[PDB]
Design a protein around this ligand. Structure first.
Ligand SMILES: NC(=O)CC[C@H](N)C(=O)O
Ligand SMILES: NC(=O)CC[C@H](N)C(=O)O
Lengths: 242, 242
């Protein structure tokens, strides 16, 4: 029996699912599993211990985004530290890791780079400056974040904007601050829950986010597939590191 | 047959000794002992097991500062974890604990928080924002750190700056990110070994650090004594916790 490679998507929050990264991994031949960290009934009370699965059952694991601060005392005090422990165990066993937004920030904290409120948020589609366009293209990429990470020791920063570090590699781990996975329906799920932003008072508006996303669909679908393929080609091939 | 209270100063690095904290505990009537973790010949190679003393022989134990990251894998895999075990044993036994800088971070890590590299290093004298001026005064207090902690679950943050958390209480333990102990002579030992920073190229210069320290000698001497007295009054009196 031939073993297809296996990826685990870690749903840190229930509205932040794998979307086009799922398609990308499926098209690279991966079987897909998912793990729910915070169920929908805990979206306003995320704190509480959670038992993560053994990462060595997978070739790649993917912690995805979420709305809470990765440095929240009661999250670090419960399931964030358990997730950090899972990432360390996976790194050490040579599993590949692709972290997105909150998940990239979690990787930074795991390996000793702190995360904090950013001086200037990024909400919308943005280009970035990259050192390796063959791995992290200039984009544009969709962003929705108010925290930024400090690149951890031993990591190499690959890409950035003026406002935030955007991608780093550490061994077979790649952390991303942007959402390469976002398509029209995933965005709509976020827009419908953005209570305080529907009025436009936070420097953006839903209509313009929706429209820019509509325009960039075909382009963004190609980029996420190239991103995943390059991640498999270049990062999972590195020696493991921590 | 009188039994004076006993305090153990844990010298994590040979240049970070108790200085004015020793004087303040002595004036509060304490007999003083010290324990060397990393001897001078290991300053560049700190990794390696160390057998720590029994904390229950003391009324207060005080882990002091050090230049290495408390999350360094080879230190966690040796004596940093043994120190964390000593702290947990102390806390459970009702021993008081005062952690300074590296020592305060070690407490954060012991009790389930996190420690990581900060965005903005804090080097010099700074005021802090406090919730209880009778425990942690605004200061100013001397800082020299590149890492910052997340407050461990169950602990209460007392003070902070915009850049980092500065003090928390957990049971009979008080963790500090700043150096209440530093005097002119202690600082001179640090400046003499600050090889990368003498040229002024790291955002500070030794001349201004020394001048500000000299100006504040008398006020700082009063503050560290008041801090120790309040620690004894309000933290050591607390119910033990971990
Ligand atoms: N797209 C989202 O809903 C994530 C946004 C959220 N503010 C974050 O931490 O990234
Ligand atoms: N606690 C400290 O950081 C003292 C100074 C610092 N260890 C140095 O590099 O000299």
């Amino acid at each position: 029996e031939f073993m297809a490679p296996k990826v685990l998507f870690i749903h840190n929050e229930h509205m932040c699912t794998e979307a086009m990264l799922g398609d990308a991994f499926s098209e690279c031949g991966f079987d897909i599993e998912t793990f729910e960290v915070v169920p929908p009934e805990r979206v306003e009370t995320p704190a509480g211990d959670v038992a993560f699965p053994d990462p060595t059952a997978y070739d790649v694991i993917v912690p995805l985004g979420a709305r809470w601060p990765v440095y929240e005392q009661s999250l670090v005090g419960t399931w964030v530290t358990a997730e950090m422990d899972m990432m360390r165990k996976a790194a050490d066993a040579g599993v590949g890791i692709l972290g997105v937004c909150f998940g990239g920030q979690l990787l930074a904290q795991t390996f000793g780079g702190s995360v904090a409120r950013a001086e200037t948020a990024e909400v919308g589609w943005f280009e970035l400056d990259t050192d390796d366009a063959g791995l992290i293209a200039p984009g544009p990429w969709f962003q929705w974040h108010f925290d930024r990470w400090t690149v951890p020791p031993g990591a190499t920063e690959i890409a950035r904007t003026s406002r935030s570090s955007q991608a780093f590699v550490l061994g077979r781990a790649l952390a991303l601050q942007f959402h390469p996975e976002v398509d029209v329906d995933l965005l709509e799920g976020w827009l419908a829950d953005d209570r305080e932003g529907i009025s436009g008072k936070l420097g953006y508006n839903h209509d313009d986010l929706r429209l820019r996303t509509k325009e960039l669909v075909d382009d963004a679908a190609v980029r996420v597939r190239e991103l995943v393929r390059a991640f498999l080609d270049k990062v999972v091939r590195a020696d493991p590191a921590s």
